[PDB]
Amino acid sequence: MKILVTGGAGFIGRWVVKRLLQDKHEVWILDNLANSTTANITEFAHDLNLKQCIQGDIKDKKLVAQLFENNSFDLCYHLAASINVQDSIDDARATFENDTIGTFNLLEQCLNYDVKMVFMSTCMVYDKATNIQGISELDPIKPASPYAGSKIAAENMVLSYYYAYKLPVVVIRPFNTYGPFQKTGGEGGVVAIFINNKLDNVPLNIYGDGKQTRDLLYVEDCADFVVAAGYSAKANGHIINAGTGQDISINKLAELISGNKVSIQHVTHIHPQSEIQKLLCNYEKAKTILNWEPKVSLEDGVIKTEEWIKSLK
């Protein structure tokens, strides 16, 4: 198939690309490299099925039109986005423009050329879990940051095209994802930051009281879920979560990762008003529709991730 992966040079994107190339699809990447480098895709530089890596912006309407007009895509995995909650609080407009308007630009061309869209949403668009069964696709939404609001906004434009036009789309809500190729600095995820701090012999710092929880999904499991949603016509028109169905507090995550190599401290929460106290995924729908389940435990994923991070030092 001919496939466009927006954000394909990013963390999750590069793993989506890897899987699609293993499956011998012709892949085009569209990525402005705002949050990544081509080091994430060097591995694929000699794969003839990686057709092009376009350094361009989903906000550039003319570029997006030309890209679809001059290719014949079957399928688009739309991962390109601004992803940082705090940045979206500091600067809502940029997050809105990238995550809602950029989506809309792509969606318009998907309709013009009958291109199925897998829209990468986020488990952040949820209000907190309230029990051990976790959050299903039927459970309440709560846009606690402009990032979350922009993602919900995008979801609803995407789904409107499915209803109004019968355009194949899937809205996916993976939970917090970690692993090799995730950044380790201030724009990184908590697992990457903590492992890197450990390797650097500096403390782990926990925002707030650390009791907040996350359901942490290893990136290779996430990428397989993302790809599966694109391949499945049964998924068309659906919202589908992915996660592990187990959560951990940030306090306990810090102890797991440090293993007492470094100290663990608390600091003022940067956005307690936008925090989600408990994130725990019910992924029964993904199991049913996609035959998907995660294979990598947190313990094993941390080990894999630390091996990767250490390899770059």
Ligand X SMILES: NC(=O)c1ccc[n+]([C@@H]2O[C@H](COP(=O)([O-])OP(=O)(O)OC[C@H]3O[C@@H](n4cnc5c(N)ncnc54)[C@H](O)[C@@H]3O)[C@@H](O)[C@H]2O)c1
Residue numbers at the binding site for ligand X (CB under 6 A): 7, 9-13, 30-36, 57-59, 79-83, 98, 102, 120, 122, 174, 176-177, 189
CB atoms within 10 A of CB 48: 7
Helix (H) or strand (E) holding 176: none
Residues 68-127 that bind Cl ion (CB under 5 A): 122
Question: Within the chain, what is the greatest distance between any pair of CA atoms?
Answer: 56
Which residues make Cβ contacts (< 8 Å) with residue 112, sequence separation at least 6? Answer: 68
- The Cα–Cα gap between 75 and 73 comes to 6
Q: What would the x/- binding string for Cl ion be over residues 230 to 259, using CB under 5 A?
A: -------------------x-x--------
Map tokens 């940051």 to a residue: 145
- The Cα–Cα gap between 103 and 90 comes to 21
Q: Which is nearer to ligand UDP, 179 or 189 (CB)?
A: 189
Map tokens 């291109």 to a residue: 115
Map tokens 């529709």 to a residue: 289
- Among 77, 147, 162, 283, the active-site one is 147
> For this structure, is 218 an active site residue?
no
- The Cα–Cα gap between 18 and 113 comes to 25
- The Cα–Cα gap between 110 and 117 comes to 7
Q: What would the x/- binding string for a copy of itself be over residues 115 to 154, using CB under 8 A?
A: -----------------------x-xxxxxxx-xxx-xxx
Q: What would the x/- binding string for Na ion be over residues 232 to 271, using CB under 5 A?
A: ---------------x------------------------
Binding-site residues for NAD(+), in ranges, read 11-12, 31, 34-35, 57-58, 79, 81, 98, 151, 177
Active site residues: 147
Binding-site residue set for UDP: 176, 190, 205, 207, 212, 214, 275
Binding site for a copy of itself (CB under 8 A): 88-89, 92-93, 96, 100-101, 104, 108, 138, 140-146, 148-150, 152-154, 156-157, 159-161, 163-166, 271, 273-274
